[model samples]
Target: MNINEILKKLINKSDLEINEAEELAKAIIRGEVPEILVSAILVALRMKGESKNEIVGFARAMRELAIKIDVPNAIDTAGTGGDGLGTVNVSTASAILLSLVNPVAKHGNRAVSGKSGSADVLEALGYNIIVPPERAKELVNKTNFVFLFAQYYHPAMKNVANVRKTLGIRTIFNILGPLTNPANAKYQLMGVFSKDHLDLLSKSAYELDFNKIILVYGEPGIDEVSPIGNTFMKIVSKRGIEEVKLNVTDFGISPIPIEKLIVNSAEDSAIKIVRAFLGKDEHVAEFIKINTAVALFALDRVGDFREGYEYADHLIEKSLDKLNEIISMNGDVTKLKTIVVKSSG
Candidate 1:
């Protein structure tokens, strides 16, 4: 199963079984293939699109190679973040808020395509994105939330990091990141940029046995739940998978435009997150609350989106204390405070 054969198969619109896909991904990651061939393989897959078996197999290969982690009862809330929305790190803020409600193992990367990635925003806030694995374990064991920097945990990806950066487009890697959580999160509140990806990613997650999952595709193309128009939802739980439409108003919020959620830079996003956590910046605050609500809903901390909304709104004020607690659990409180003040200023 070399790139030549894989390319020929993809050209014919044939799909690879999980094991074959796994073998190919491992070979590519191990640098056993040429850079051009790897690039060609990625483009070929994108041209043909991905299937449930392909995604499951590809992710299985990545997960097997990742530094294994276990955080029981933790939910991963990372979205396939190539949405190009330039919105503030909503998932990062929402994960912080969700930590106040339930346990979360937030996994993601530094920005290559966005205005700010989770790692970028955390760095702006005096949080080290790359913590020692032993300390990361403590964060998972003793704290309600932790951010697992993808680069630190997934060594194999480093092989193609330069190629991926050079290509600078959304590929299967974006979707695989969420599915290959080192912690092996059983519950997730994943987000996708498009509606089609909602089905693709949701079913893939189900195939990977991620119970109690929620896949959201916001209208107008952001990955987070919009306070604007309709959003699509796919819930994977004990009762099996269910798809539904979501309205902002039904969740007790009014319509919002995409412009309302945009941030100027990682610094700006950090400020918005801090302010929103303190219950300031209603637009950003509402954005965080709604996404947090959905995360909690998927984690079963709340019964429905409405309940999740209420939980999110109420947490805004209390989140200040919770944020401090989370930081103190693994980082310096004074350093965090100074960084927050600087970002806010």
Candidate 2:
């Protein structure tokens, strides 16, 4: 079907079959579809509400165009935006901490999605954002930690940039972004803005044939497993998906004040993330411990979250040497400065 026909059906709230969505996504990625058509399709998908199959189809097309990075046995920690919590980059800090567990960590992210996206925070902490895909893999292999800039790897997304900016609201693309990891990471810990998305995204991950996936939605609405309240989770493994709830008290940690985690700008968020990872035992530090523990448990490096929490705490308390190893091996500090200047400006 042409763009006009697709738009008409979408506007009427008709569900798109997987094949149709795949064809439309292919057209968009190939630049065969006009920008207007791309924008219309995105807006239409938003209005109609996206389905699991539609999201999977779009993700397949996106993966096809993404610059593949060959990092075997790596783990990814990504989040879907729209939670509306202006917290600093907890997941980004968590990803860094997770790397200390001997598994290469690749954080699939972009800039400015929430109060501070993962890439924005990483740039502020002296990490290169525009490194080539090969360099990214090298960094991961050497240091076990690297940031994958979504735009750099998925060049096709540039076609929808203006459309997204003009629309300036949450859309289907925001959710699909996390599901389209080019590295094809077998292990992942993902956060969703809404509880309703837990099952949907987990099922989609299962369909994508991910080896192990943990989907989380904090009761208070922050995407990462909240340190302030109970966190709802769905674990998808080779066996099947299991649902569970986790609380801060279970980890012998107290709830952090929400205001203490607020991030006003990307730079501000980056500072908080660095402090947390550097073993500062502040409120955010404990939150990072809990978040990182979840990643460790998801990777099956630890028996359970409590054990993972203790392991992460010990790493921070003893000041894991791996932290410095990652900083030194990941990227050029000078380029990181330039990226921060450009992003903040």
Candidate 3:
């Protein structure tokens, strides 16, 4: 299947099949597809809407191409880009809190197409971003939380870098990146930009035979189970797909004003995360608790979001100790403190 051949069919307004999408994605990643074809296919898919089977097939191909890692008991929490909301790192902070509760987290992320990507904020908070794959595994084993730099593990992604850069738009690449976890984690909490994709993403995960998965989109378009508004969720497991709406009030947490969660830069966002972990009783802390609760619920550490909320609240209160543990492990508490202080100041 050559790029010209595929583009000819697509130009005729024909959609690619699941297998065709998979093969095209592989070719694009492998540099076999031209930039024009790559951009054309991505724009066309975004315009026509990606099918459930197509997404699943592309994700399967991506996983196959990724640099594999082994993290025995880890969870992956990620969000599909295009949410367009500039809130603080809710899911990233939640992943850190989940780490405090013992489920190692391999957070897959990249710094593109969003105000502040998870890896971007984590880098501002003093964690290395471009760590080797083996070091990522070691960090997960030792600290319970590690950010798997997407581009580092998936060398093929580099092939499309110029295309994404030149286009400067959200493409299919943004959506499929989260689903391709190099670590192959069984549990995941994923956020998407639109509620229409809830069933589609859930069905895709079901087809992939994932152990446990949650596909979520907040009402106002911010992902990560919004604390300020209603959150639409689609849970996929052995039982089947269950769709429902969750609100922060249901868990006894007051809705936070969205403005409080906004940040001007990754450094600003990193400061908010550090402040939340330091036991600051602000809107960010409440939002982090809500996000972490969903993570804990996904991990089966709690029966439901209500129970998970309680657990997350308790964990946030003790995050100082968690921070201490992280600092102790890194052997530079003062330097770590300085980074947080400087960023926050």
Candidate 4:
């Protein structure tokens, strides 16, 4: 009922029920919970381990407190960062590709643990990340894709900002962003930092009333479906969560060398995405295609991964047009062209 009570429960290594976690989260977002208590509970929960109910409860509170938007039947491709794999922005590129056929509120922030985040690469590719909520809606409607920069949507999160910074550790807040899309996306293609969270996040998505969510973890802990090796997955739907595994060959995709996918900066990631879209880089294209295929599967656009893979391959070049249009409307088209030219060479 209160932070003090919740704090005691967490200290005792007790998991908060969904409603209890929601109430406590509401208090924290409302700034009713003291910073000291906020920090303490965050640390305590980390020590005791965050449970599905707690993640869902906090996610519910976050959704209620965030600046809301209206994007019906929209899908988000926001995976948990902190994967530390330093892979290029596959989700961002895939969301852009998916927008060719579906509404996508690609939620992201600047980099946390990787060389670039979705927002970072999108910015580097000349898509504006910071815009008013009204404008964000217009962009999604016009282009079928909009980047919901995390900081722009969740003002309530500021209440715990200072404490999170001072503590300087991975907290529950890290994974909460993808769970709190301001657009309230109907479906999500979420990847997590660890395979352990595959079930945790799948259950959380079900609790949040998502129509469907495909939670994924690439082997060796990369977030998006890995092209290098195996990936663990959970598909949470109305019936329940179902588990699956995928190999690169399952989709007829070749193994992409990991060193080729790693990037040094947002610009580097942006170049890779553009090159892939232009069909100049087959390795990265297959990588992005496999991830986008999984997204297509998540949206139910295709019946299976192989079908989705073929669908995504056909749509790759089309995404470049959409990318240019998105940039022209709110970002810099010249910047995009410059990257295209460089990537071409």
Residue-level lDDT tens digits of model 4 in 1-345: 867888899999999999999999899888998888999999999999999999999999998888888885999988888647588889989888899989888888887544488888888888878978999999988988888888888887888889988999989998988888899888889988898888888878887888888889988678889788899999998889898998888998678888888888999999998988888888888989899999999888799998999999888978888888889998988889999998983
Each model's RMSD to truth, in Å? 1.8, 3.7, 2.2, 1.4
lDDT by residue (28-107, candidate 1, tens digit) is 88889899988888888888988888898889888888897777578888888864658888888888777776677888
TM-score-superior candidate, 1 or 3? 1
Clashing pairs in 2: none
Badly placed stretches (over 4 Å) of model 2 are: 113-115, 317-321, 332-345
User: Which should have the higher lDDT, number 1 or number 2?
Assistant: 1
Q: What is the TM-score of each candidate against the true structure?
A: 0.94, 0.90, 0.92, 0.96
Model 3 per-residue lDDT tens digits across residues 1-345: 777877777666677777887888888888887787788987777777777767877887888888888764678788886747688877777777778866555555656544488877766665666767777777777887666788788888889899889988887777776677777777888888887777778888888766788888877787678767799998888779988898878778788888888887777787788877765547889888887787788788798888888888888876756655754554456645775676452
Best by TM-score: 4
Local error of candidate 2 at residue 62 (angstroms):
0.4
lDDT of 1 at 102: 68
Candidate 2, 34-107: lDDT as tens digits: 87778878888877888888888888888888888866478888888674867777777777667766555464
TM-score ranking from best candidate downward: 4, 1, 3, 2
Summing lDDT over every window of 10 consecutive residues in candidate 1, give the lowest-scoring window.
336-345
* TM-score of decoy 2: 0.90
Candidate 3 structure lDDT: 0.76
- Please tell me which model should have the higher lDDT, number 2 or number 3: 3
Q: Provide the lowest-lDDT 10-residue window in model 3.
A: 326-335
